[PDB]
Amino acid sequence: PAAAALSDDDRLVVAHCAALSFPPASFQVHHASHPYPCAAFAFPPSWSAAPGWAAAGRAAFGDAEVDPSLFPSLRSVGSGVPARANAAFLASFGALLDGSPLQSEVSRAVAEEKRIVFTGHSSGGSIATLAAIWFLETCTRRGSVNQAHPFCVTFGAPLVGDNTFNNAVRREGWSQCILNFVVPVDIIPRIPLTPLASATEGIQAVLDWLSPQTPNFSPSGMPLIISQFYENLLRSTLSIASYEACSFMGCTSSILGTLTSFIELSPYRPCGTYLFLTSSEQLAVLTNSDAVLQLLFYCLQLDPQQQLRDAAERSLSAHWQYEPIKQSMMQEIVCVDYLGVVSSTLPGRQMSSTIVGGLELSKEAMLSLSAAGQWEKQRETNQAKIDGASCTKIREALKSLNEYKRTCELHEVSYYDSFKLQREVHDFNANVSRLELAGLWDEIVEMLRRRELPDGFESRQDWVNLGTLYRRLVEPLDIANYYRHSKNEDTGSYLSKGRPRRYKYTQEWHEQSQRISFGSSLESCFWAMAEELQAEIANGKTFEDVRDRVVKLESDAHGWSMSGSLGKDIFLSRSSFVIWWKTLPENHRSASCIAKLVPW
Amino acid sequence: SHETKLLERMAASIECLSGKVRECFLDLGCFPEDKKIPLDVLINIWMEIHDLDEPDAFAILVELSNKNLLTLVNDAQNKAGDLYSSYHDFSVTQHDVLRDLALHMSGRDALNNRRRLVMPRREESLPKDWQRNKDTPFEAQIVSIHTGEMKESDWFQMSFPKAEVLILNFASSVYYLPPFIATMQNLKALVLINYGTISATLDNLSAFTTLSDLRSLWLEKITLPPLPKTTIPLKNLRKISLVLCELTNSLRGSKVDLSMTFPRLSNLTIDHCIDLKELPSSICEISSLESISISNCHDLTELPYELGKLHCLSILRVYACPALWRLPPSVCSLKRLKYLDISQCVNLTDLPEELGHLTSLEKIDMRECSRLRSLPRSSSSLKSLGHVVCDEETALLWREAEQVIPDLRVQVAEECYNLDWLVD
Amino acid sequence: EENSMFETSHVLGALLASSPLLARAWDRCAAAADGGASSLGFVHGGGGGGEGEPVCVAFSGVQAALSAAAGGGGGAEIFKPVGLRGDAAGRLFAPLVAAEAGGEPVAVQALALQGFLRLCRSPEFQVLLNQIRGKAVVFTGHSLGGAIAALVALHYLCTSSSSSAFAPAPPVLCVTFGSPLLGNQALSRAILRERWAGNFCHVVSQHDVVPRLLFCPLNVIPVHIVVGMQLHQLPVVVATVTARMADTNQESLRQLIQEHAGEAAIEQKLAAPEIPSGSPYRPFGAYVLCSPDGAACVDNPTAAVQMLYATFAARRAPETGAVPPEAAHSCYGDLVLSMPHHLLLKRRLGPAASNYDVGISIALEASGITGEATEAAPARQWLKTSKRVGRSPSLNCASLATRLGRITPCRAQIEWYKALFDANTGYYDAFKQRLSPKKFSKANMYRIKLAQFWDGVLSMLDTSQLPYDFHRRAKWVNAAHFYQLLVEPLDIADYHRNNLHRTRGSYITHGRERRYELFDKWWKQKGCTDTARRSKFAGLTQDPCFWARVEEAREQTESAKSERDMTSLARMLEDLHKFERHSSELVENKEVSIDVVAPQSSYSLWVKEWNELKLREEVRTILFQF
Ligand SMILES: Nc1ncnc2c1ncn2[C@@H]1O[C@H](COP(=O)(O)OP(=O)(O)O)[C@@H](O)[C@H]1O[C@@H]1O[C@H](COP(=O)(O)O)[C@@H](O)[C@H]1O
């Protein structure tokens, strides 16, 4: 990860953001020309548990779905599952977009050719993360891809998002644009891990202590509710860390599934690059999300001789210690990698609580970090195998099927009709190639479901183009196999009930790349809609009852033929569609949008 | 017409080739029309007729096939070009026009006392012209007969003093051997291919006693009658080919010393034997045997225990035998073995532990042996293996043996699917 | 290898300890122990958080212990195992024992069964069962009563499958908070085969005697000490039971139970079912071995026994006095309060080969064993035996996908063979009659290959090398359904060609393969968890066993053609009429393939023979009454 190292321009930007966040709704605009012209948008923090942090809802964690209009890419490409985030934080950002003039200010800086950045402290930095993603979505959708990527600098921001949310940003490649500075003893980033709505009194109490405006001059000291809340926070952090630890370690126990329904697990996961402030001269940089989550707990373990009241006081005061970042960033700071150093350490040797980058971790912490590092290496190894023998075999099978299509096209027949009959040896050979292709593609889909591959696999143009070619050449063959075995009379329609998941995944990959409406690229599944129409017309229904569906089919065929996505074997004067069309009533045939594409 | 405009061109092209090649072309023409011709029987009859025991017969066959004169059908799952395995996996198919030209060339000779007598028709009765010319028996070396259900009364007196081979193609449930089969004193090969969909029996067994100097036999779809106590020594017999023959345990009840009935038998081939529980142990008492080939037998449960008594076997080809599960230990004590084939043995649990004693072994074929997942350690002592064909799963097993034996080569072969089974 | 493998038991133990579920369970257990002398069970309560917290129900079996102590111990008299299929009431555990054949039925402890029956007598228990229906229930309890709770939990789950016809069953978790062994290995196998072992937990103290005293043979089992330990939880026969405590050597008793546990912990490796001298009691579910340092969760029953023996054998320093069973069984609250505190402490360390060894050592220290003692030397090796070696199940499924893709062309060739003979006789009759042997051999080869591949898949499933959700995936279940519907008639033809129906028995009852039954169950579950008339005959027959029924009907008709006894022929004609009606209904809906309606198919011949038999006056008279 060479991108982990911070360039001199990046360090200067971070130092400028720190000054604005910690000066010596109401967003602030700051313009600076050092090192390059830039505009900074600061977001004030929130010191209210409700509705600032937790809204009014029956959910125990305050999670809500993301608005599709504002964030159309924050979703699972394969399955279409929308991402989730904090309800209060999402609502606050939406108010700024509609009410605040922030939408006008960000456009002006773009017109000034200035790279924009987002900065914030505590809950303010959480909103800045959403703002940076929103700017990325607008630029990506339009043709202005030359715009500079936003810089999201956060200082101790609470965890916001979900597993789907974290996966989406990594797939696009926007994780490098988000920088998170977190003190190892800070308590604020770990607050979302404990249930927020269930325990609001404790959250409000600690927020009042951390609020600079709120006076905190209790003669006795920290209230007992805060001390009790700290103990519950540590226990809650242990539960979520342990549950996620078994995921990448290989536990696979039948009791884990049942325990999920009986214990409360926080859905929030770390997102972006995290830079732990281990010391003044060192800055641990971690990019793996799993490693960051483990570090959030093992860095708060109690000392051998210390009370929970004393530990809570240090954690509370650590939230207001990000000020020396600006002064330290001016000089060179060793950006020592943490996952590499832990992995480089020999097993057994130096297994004690060594410095290991300045943070004296525990024995279980070393094992957890090592397991997380090996999990990342395993995923890279799986991609190498898929990109090797598997990729070569797919291309050879496609070449064989292309020749079969060419051979049938020379006899003025469609390869769809020929495959449906399955008369000669050529049809059998095509069937063998189709079965081999299905197995190779299913392995890729199966591994993607369980996250055994890097998040950027679905964004590579080589695989997207290969999937489109595979879909637009073999789907009609699969449709013919479905209807030649009379599988539509015992299960259902091809487009409704029985459709391979691999074709759905490939279609969604192509739609996302071209930024088109989802579910509109149905050119491959053209014969399926035609066969169903021919089935209904012969099941008792008349043409007048289904003429509404016929004209929709004709309109889609005309539009696809203009772009060229439509197959060239549909109007070869000997296909089933051409013969069926001529048998239609003369009134429809006389006035149709495909009256000239047919080989009359 | 086409006889002089086009057929005469092919006749003149054949006339360019002189002697052995032309007579080989005529012999191929005499074979049944549109029928798959195994390579082994064709090579055997060529060696018998033209004395081409040397590989010059193979060279002549290659030269003939190089001029688009005969089609050499070759199995797709074959990694050997012109090896011993390929020598028993090919087939020869001739074109109709070339066969018609050969028939015209044969008809150029006299009707009687010709060199080759062929009747290219499916008429149930015997040819009337041959009956008219039955007064003067012919001396044709090759005679072709194509009749349906024929009984003893449906025959008349023929003789062939100089004949060495005869082809009999028929389709019926029973058959009676014609009396004139007792006329050739130098008959060397007999063909009894049956087109009947039902199993066909044979009659006139005493005629087999009259047969002498016979060295080849190719039965197909024929129910083998039980062998009686009578010796009937076919001393000159060397090769027997049984394809789709239902023994019906007739040889099970026969207890005759096979060292005298078939003393010079060398090659035995059992193909597509539908009903065969176990081969008799008497076949282990023939020391002259050198090539056993059991193919597509789904009922053969166990090989004979005393298989090592042969002490002369060189090629063992037992493939497509799902019922077989273990190999007899005596196969370890079988010197001079060079080609072992256990391909498509789906239910082969393991190999014998004394495989190391199998010296001079050169090629092992264990393709599609899914159950076989362990190899004996003695296999590391085979200092003669040079080529092994097997799947990828057993490649890891052979990875240990390939280090000890430097010249050992492991070839990975994948299953191939075809639709030829329907063609027939 | 070892460097790439990590130990996960301590992580699961920490996850269990961090959650307040154990604390709430112990609070309910203490509430029951404080005055549950009434016939009604412990107060359900719910905790106020009906949605946030699942309903927590405790079960104290002190009254059952008093009833047992009234009749005295006698020696195994209260510990004699009792079956479920034959004895007691099989209605409660019909899904548990509806197929029992091996080493006795599932069986259960007599005292736990008596307590369960006593609880079932009270209508308030049934009312509470009705109230908690459709929700999540946490079943707790201390000592034998906890085991009783487990039984109750089982019963609840044993009925949940009845209610969860379409939707998945609600999650119910039982803890039993430390109880003696309930069932033998048969019960554990029955629970595991139902995918039902993940709903039970067990927390056992390091030096507790009750959870491990059942390891000794039943003839020497100290019933008195266990019944008195249960009695001790009651607030202050009782004098006589407490008198048995004093007249018992703690050191000698510890020696006996340690010897018995050592004898029983190594018998698994030397599996000798011919010599079942030891007590049949075996643990089930997952055991959370707890200690003041921490916890360790073990799921392998053999590893559970090994770890239990290791942790009891490993004694603390001799300066500590002999641990009394009362304190050992009555200190669980202190441990519940202590383990999270110790797990939240960053204890500084004061030449490990690999990370796996470090994890094993950490788990052993959390389990409470003494590192300096020699008992840790075998236990580590035991911990190495429990862990499985191989690739992840996800990669196994990914490889199996391409394996199935490569094997499918055999099924395509079988389909071609079937389509070849679909116009004259049918592929079933052609396969049975072995017509065209040159193609029958190829069909048999492909069938054998497909059967071997599917048997290998099933064997991989049985070993637990595949994901638990394998049977709930559309691709695998539909592929299995296609393979079954296409190949099973060939298997039936092969079975009936060897005349196995007259020797082995009926194919549907005894001759059917486990693979086809599993595939049918998978299809049925898929249909439940998730019509226009067919204008043409289906490609494949919907009923995979239709041909077996046809053969049975033909045999019955042939027998009836010669049967003379009116009483027998009446029932055989009734069965023939039932099958004729079923076949007519199937044909009218066109749910059968065209090869069934083939002119020379066996179905047409059977129909002709049945009509000829019906033409008989006696058959017509018999059918007229029916
Ligand atoms: N009635 C059915 N019978 C048998 N298989 C079916 C049926 N309906 C769908 N399928 C297949 O089941 C898979 C769904 O699992 P899916 O991939 O979504 O994964 P999950 O849902 O578990 O995550 C898809 O591949 C469907 O493939 C289509 O059906 C033909 C099968 O023919 P084939 O056996 O030669 O392939 C193919 O031609 C394709 O038209």
Tab-separated table of C-alpha atoms in Angstrom, chain C residues 351-503:
chain	number	residue	atom	x	y	z
C	351	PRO	CA	9.667	-19.912	22.450
C	352	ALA	CA	6.245	-20.762	21.024
C	353	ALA	CA	6.392	-22.662	17.741
C	354	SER	CA	3.365	-21.060	16.069
C	355	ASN	CA	0.315	-18.906	16.735
C	356	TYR	CA	-1.765	-22.078	17.110
C	357	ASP	CA	0.329	-23.098	20.124
C	358	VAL	CA	-0.100	-19.620	21.625
C	359	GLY	CA	-3.863	-19.853	21.173
C	360	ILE	CA	-3.945	-23.325	22.724
C	361	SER	CA	-1.926	-22.105	25.716
C	362	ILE	CA	-4.186	-19.067	26.162
C	363	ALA	CA	-7.304	-21.249	26.000
C	364	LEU	CA	-5.801	-23.672	28.528
C	365	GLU	CA	-4.959	-20.832	30.922
C	366	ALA	CA	-8.499	-19.493	30.516
C	367	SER	CA	-9.874	-23.002	31.130
C	368	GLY	CA	-8.265	-22.982	34.587
C	369	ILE	CA	-5.815	-25.863	34.173
C	370	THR	CA	-2.408	-25.661	35.841
C	371	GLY	CA	0.341	-25.034	33.303
C	372	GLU	CA	3.104	-26.376	35.546
C	373	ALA	CA	1.249	-29.674	36.006
C	374	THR	CA	1.777	-32.529	33.561
C	375	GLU	CA	-1.978	-32.672	32.860
C	376	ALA	CA	-1.555	-29.853	30.328
C	377	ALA	CA	0.756	-32.031	28.214
C	378	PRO	CA	-1.948	-34.403	26.862
C	379	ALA	CA	-4.732	-31.801	26.874
C	380	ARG	CA	-2.910	-29.647	24.316
C	381	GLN	CA	-2.669	-32.713	22.079
C	382	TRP	CA	-6.372	-33.284	22.728
C	383	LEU	CA	-6.991	-29.685	21.665
C	384	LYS	CA	-5.071	-30.504	18.479
C	385	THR	CA	-7.352	-33.472	17.760
C	386	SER	CA	-10.616	-31.504	17.929
C	387	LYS	CA	-9.618	-29.017	15.225
C	388	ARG	CA	-10.225	-30.160	11.647
C	389	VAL	CA	-7.555	-29.757	8.932
C	390	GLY	CA	-8.495	-28.713	5.415
C	391	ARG	CA	-9.805	-25.874	3.303
C	392	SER	CA	-12.755	-23.700	4.261
C	393	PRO	CA	-16.215	-25.084	3.393
C	394	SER	CA	-16.824	-22.110	1.085
C	395	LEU	CA	-13.894	-23.153	-1.109
C	396	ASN	CA	-15.177	-26.740	-1.034
C	397	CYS	CA	-18.551	-25.556	-2.346
C	398	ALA	CA	-16.839	-23.396	-4.977
C	399	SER	CA	-14.851	-26.399	-6.222
C	400	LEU	CA	-17.953	-28.607	-6.119
C	401	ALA	CA	-19.682	-26.101	-8.407
C	402	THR	CA	-17.165	-26.657	-11.207
C	403	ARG	CA	-17.103	-30.394	-10.455
C	404	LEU	CA	-20.866	-30.537	-11.037
C	405	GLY	CA	-20.431	-28.427	-14.165
C	406	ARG	CA	-17.930	-30.966	-15.489
C	407	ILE	CA	-20.084	-33.966	-14.522
C	408	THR	CA	-23.346	-32.639	-16.036
C	409	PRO	CA	-22.573	-33.773	-19.649
C	410	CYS	CA	-23.101	-37.333	-18.390
C	411	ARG	CA	-26.637	-36.285	-17.446
C	412	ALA	CA	-26.982	-34.693	-20.892
C	413	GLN	CA	-26.015	-38.004	-22.514
C	414	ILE	CA	-28.545	-39.788	-20.293
C	415	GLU	CA	-31.160	-37.296	-21.511
C	416	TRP	CA	-30.224	-38.088	-25.119
C	417	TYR	CA	-30.546	-41.811	-24.384
C	418	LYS	CA	-33.990	-41.242	-22.858
C	419	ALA	CA	-35.133	-39.154	-25.829
C	420	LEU	CA	-33.945	-41.905	-28.182
C	421	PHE	CA	-36.507	-44.459	-26.938
C	422	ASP	CA	-39.375	-42.104	-26.038
C	423	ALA	CA	-41.543	-43.022	-29.055
C	424	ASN	CA	-41.818	-46.840	-28.965
C	425	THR	CA	-41.313	-48.377	-25.509
C	426	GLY	CA	-39.721	-45.873	-23.142
C	427	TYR	CA	-36.245	-45.508	-21.689
C	428	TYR	CA	-37.248	-47.273	-18.458
C	429	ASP	CA	-38.305	-50.474	-20.231
C	430	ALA	CA	-35.354	-50.253	-22.630
C	431	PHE	CA	-32.938	-49.999	-19.697
C	432	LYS	CA	-34.683	-52.850	-17.871
C	433	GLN	CA	-34.682	-55.074	-20.974
C	434	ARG	CA	-31.114	-54.009	-21.905
C	435	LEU	CA	-32.105	-53.322	-25.507
C	436	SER	CA	-29.264	-52.049	-27.717
C	437	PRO	CA	-26.445	-53.093	-25.347
C	438	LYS	CA	-23.883	-50.796	-26.998
C	439	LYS	CA	-25.914	-47.850	-25.659
C	440	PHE	CA	-27.124	-49.515	-22.454
C	441	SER	CA	-23.499	-49.923	-21.354
C	442	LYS	CA	-22.836	-46.207	-21.885
C	443	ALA	CA	-26.020	-45.299	-20.005
C	444	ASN	CA	-25.009	-47.561	-17.110
C	445	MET	CA	-21.522	-46.020	-17.051
C	446	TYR	CA	-22.946	-42.498	-16.880
C	447	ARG	CA	-25.446	-43.520	-14.190
C	448	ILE	CA	-22.665	-45.066	-12.090
C	449	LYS	CA	-20.518	-41.943	-12.466
C	450	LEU	CA	-23.401	-39.666	-11.444
C	451	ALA	CA	-24.235	-41.877	-8.457
C	452	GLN	CA	-20.595	-41.875	-7.338
C	453	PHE	CA	-20.382	-38.084	-7.625
C	454	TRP	CA	-23.570	-37.556	-5.620
C	455	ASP	CA	-22.490	-40.100	-2.992
C	456	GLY	CA	-19.208	-38.216	-2.656
C	457	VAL	CA	-21.143	-34.974	-2.210
C	458	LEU	CA	-23.265	-36.599	0.505
C	459	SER	CA	-20.156	-37.975	2.229
C	460	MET	CA	-18.618	-34.493	2.186
C	461	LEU	CA	-21.829	-33.142	3.726
C	462	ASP	CA	-21.813	-35.787	6.474
C	463	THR	CA	-18.214	-34.944	7.452
C	464	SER	CA	-19.152	-31.230	7.849
C	465	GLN	CA	-16.720	-30.060	5.166
C	466	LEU	CA	-19.527	-28.041	3.520
C	467	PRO	CA	-21.407	-24.935	4.713
C	468	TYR	CA	-24.392	-25.530	7.028
C	469	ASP	CA	-26.652	-23.693	4.566
C	470	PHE	CA	-25.789	-26.087	1.718
C	471	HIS	CA	-29.217	-27.759	1.816
C	472	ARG	CA	-30.952	-24.348	1.585
C	473	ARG	CA	-29.452	-23.278	-1.759
C	474	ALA	CA	-31.626	-23.217	-4.872
C	475	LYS	CA	-28.935	-24.345	-7.325
C	476	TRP	CA	-27.934	-27.520	-5.482
C	477	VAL	CA	-31.487	-28.584	-4.638
C	478	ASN	CA	-32.795	-28.057	-8.176
C	479	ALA	CA	-29.794	-29.856	-9.681
C	480	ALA	CA	-30.408	-32.763	-7.302
C	481	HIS	CA	-34.108	-32.753	-8.213
C	482	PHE	CA	-33.280	-32.860	-11.933
C	483	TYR	CA	-30.777	-35.683	-11.434
C	484	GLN	CA	-33.254	-37.668	-9.332
C	485	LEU	CA	-36.197	-37.181	-11.697
C	486	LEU	CA	-34.058	-38.248	-14.657
C	487	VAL	CA	-31.983	-41.123	-13.244
C	488	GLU	CA	-34.103	-42.750	-10.519
C	489	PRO	CA	-36.227	-44.737	-13.042
C	490	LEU	CA	-32.972	-46.253	-14.322
C	491	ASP	CA	-32.048	-47.239	-10.760
C	492	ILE	CA	-35.495	-48.791	-10.272
C	493	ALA	CA	-35.080	-50.735	-13.519
C	494	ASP	CA	-31.667	-51.974	-12.370
C	495	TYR	CA	-33.101	-52.979	-8.983
C	496	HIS	CA	-36.009	-54.876	-10.560
C	497	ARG	CA	-33.819	-56.520	-13.222
C	498	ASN	CA	-31.837	-58.423	-10.571
C	499	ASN	CA	-35.089	-59.557	-8.878
C	500	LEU	CA	-34.031	-57.772	-5.692
C	501	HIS	CA	-37.656	-56.913	-4.863
C	502	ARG	CA	-38.286	-60.561	-3.910
C	503	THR	CA	-35.216	-60.892	-1.645
